Curated annotation (Swiss-Prot):
Residues bearing the modification Phosphoserine: 6, 60
Further facts: Present with 31400 molecules/cell in log phase SD medium.
Residue positions where S-glutathionyl cysteine is found in the record: 30
Protein name: Glutaredoxin-2
Organism: Saccharomyces cerevisiae (strain ATCC 204508 / S288c) (Baker's yeast)
Entry keyword annotation includes Phosphoprotein: yes
């Protein structure tokens, strides 16, 4: 579908992003996504209750969600991470924020 992704799907994806503090469009096969999930949930202990992780490969409309996410930011890759309104981007971006110390600042409201 790609750029044919509907307003409705895109609106729905925005709703999903807003549903939990931590949003990750993931792919179980994607190493960077496994890294991101590991970082958020294992290393940084983000409670799963505070996250929505969409395994796009496990979703029948996972492709359309990816397309929606691409419309929303331009990002074509997984993982696609949002935290508290912030489009973090992919794993390498998460990594930069982790090292920056900014990820912790971003996550502060999450643990609260
Ligand atoms: S692993 C799947 C792949 N993801 C990336 O190349 C991520 C980019 C990287 N800098 C990061 O997130 O740190 C990908 O999304 N390939 C295309 C697809 O259709 O999924």
């Amino acid at each position: 579908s790609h750029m044919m992704v509907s307003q409705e799907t895109v609106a729905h994806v925005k709703d999903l992003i807003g549903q939990k503090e931590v949003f990750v469009a993931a792919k179980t096969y994607c190493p960077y996504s496994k890294a991101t999930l590991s970082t958020l949930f294992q290393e940084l202990n983000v409670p799963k209750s505070k996250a929505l992780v969409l395994e796009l490969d496990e979703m029948s409309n996972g492709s359309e969600i990816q397309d929606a996410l691409e419309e929303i930011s331009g990002q074509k890759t997984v993982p696609n991470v949002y935290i508290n309104g912030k489009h973090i981007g992919g794993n390498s971006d998460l990594e930069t924020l982790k090292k920056n110390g900014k990820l912790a600042e971003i996550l502060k409201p999450v643990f609260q």
